[PDB]
Amino acid sequence: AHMFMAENRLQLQKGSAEETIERFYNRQGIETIEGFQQMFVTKTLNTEDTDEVKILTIWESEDSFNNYLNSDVFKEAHKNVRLKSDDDGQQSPILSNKVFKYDIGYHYQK
Amino acid sequence: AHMFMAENRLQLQKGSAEETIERFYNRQGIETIEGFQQMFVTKTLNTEDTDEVKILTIWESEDSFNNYLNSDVFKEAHKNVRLKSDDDGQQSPILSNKVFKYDIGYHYQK
Ligand code: HEM
Ligand code: HEM
Ligand SMILES: [C-]#N
Ligand SMILES: [C-]#N
Ligand SMILES: [Mg+2]
Asked: Site annotated as Transition state stabilizer: where (chains A, B)?
């Protein structure tokens, strides 16, 4: 069975990458989720006028990802997550998010 | 301090992801490079035009990755690689590559 990766790509107001990444430091239950293997939270290195933060999650299967999305644990972790565009998103530097999905065809870990 | 991720993004002819991914199964020395940690080879799902395959490499530092690019093993692994546009490359499904670079702000592995 092929592993699976999801990417949540966040476009952020310039300068806000570091404060946004810090939100991911403390766990909110992902460690309890069936099929979850790893998470990376990254800042893209470039000269763009917005920041880009990506959340990569590695899963034993797409199904395990799908089940996480429907889970109480996911819902709870995201209850206070808002976008700049939301009516109550005044304090949010998160301009947009876009989800990308991938088959992991090969993995090596030293 | 912070880990580092490099991405090589391969823009491929439609349908060629799987044959391309198979070329990455066999290690060619990257695992001997100081600071190398992990490699993922991904296929982007639900693409309708060109196929897309990404090679993600995870490093102890940007310096480690920089050293890999200068290495003999990098050279040896890539010596027979051709883009479709190369004089002898017409049969290659590889249309282009683009490199992206990331600071890893947070990582969790179950
Ligand atoms: C594909 C759907 C999504 C996945 C797989 C995902 C994954 C995750 C994970 C694994 C965590 C850590 C939670 C934990 O430690 O238990 C998290 C938290 C977080 N996510 Fe997502 N997420 C998704 C949707 C979104 C969306 C749409 C946004 C909008 C910006 C977002 C922004 C955030 C933020 C800001 C945090 C930190 C939580 C906080 O501030 O309390 N996520 N997410
Ligand atoms: C010049 C454009 C590049 C193209 C078209 C390309 C394509 C390829 C191909 C087709 C292979 C498998 C070779 C084979 O069939 O034996 C390969 C190997 C590999 N490439 Fe690239 N590549 C390029 C540059 C890069 C860059 C810049 C990186 C890192 C950012 C990278 C990371 C890797 C890794 C880790 C391997 C496996 C090497 C090993 O196991 O030692 N490649 N590349
Ligand atoms: C959420 N990423
Ligand atoms: C080469 N990727
Ligand atoms: Mg296909």
From this structure: 68
Pair B20, B53: CB distance under 8 Å: yes
Give me the CATH number covering residue B72. 3.30.70.100
Is A10 in the B-facing interface, judged by CB distances under 8 Å?
no
Q: Shortest CA distance to A13 belongs to which of A78, A69, A93, A89?
A: A93
User: By what technique were these coordinates determined?
Assistant: X-ray
Spatial separation of the C-alpha atoms in residues B3 and B102, rounded to whole Å:
9
* Alpha-carbon radius of gyration of chain A: 15
- Residues from chain B that touch A42, judged by Cβ atoms under 8 A, are 5, 102-105
Domain count, chain B: 1
* Domain with A90 in it: 1-110
B46 CA to centre of ligand 2 in angstroms: 24
Resolution in A: 1.8
DSSP string, A14-65: TT-HHHHHHTTSS-SSGGGSTTEEEEEEEEE-S--SEEEEEEEEEES-HHHH
Locate A67 and state its tokens: 């089940």
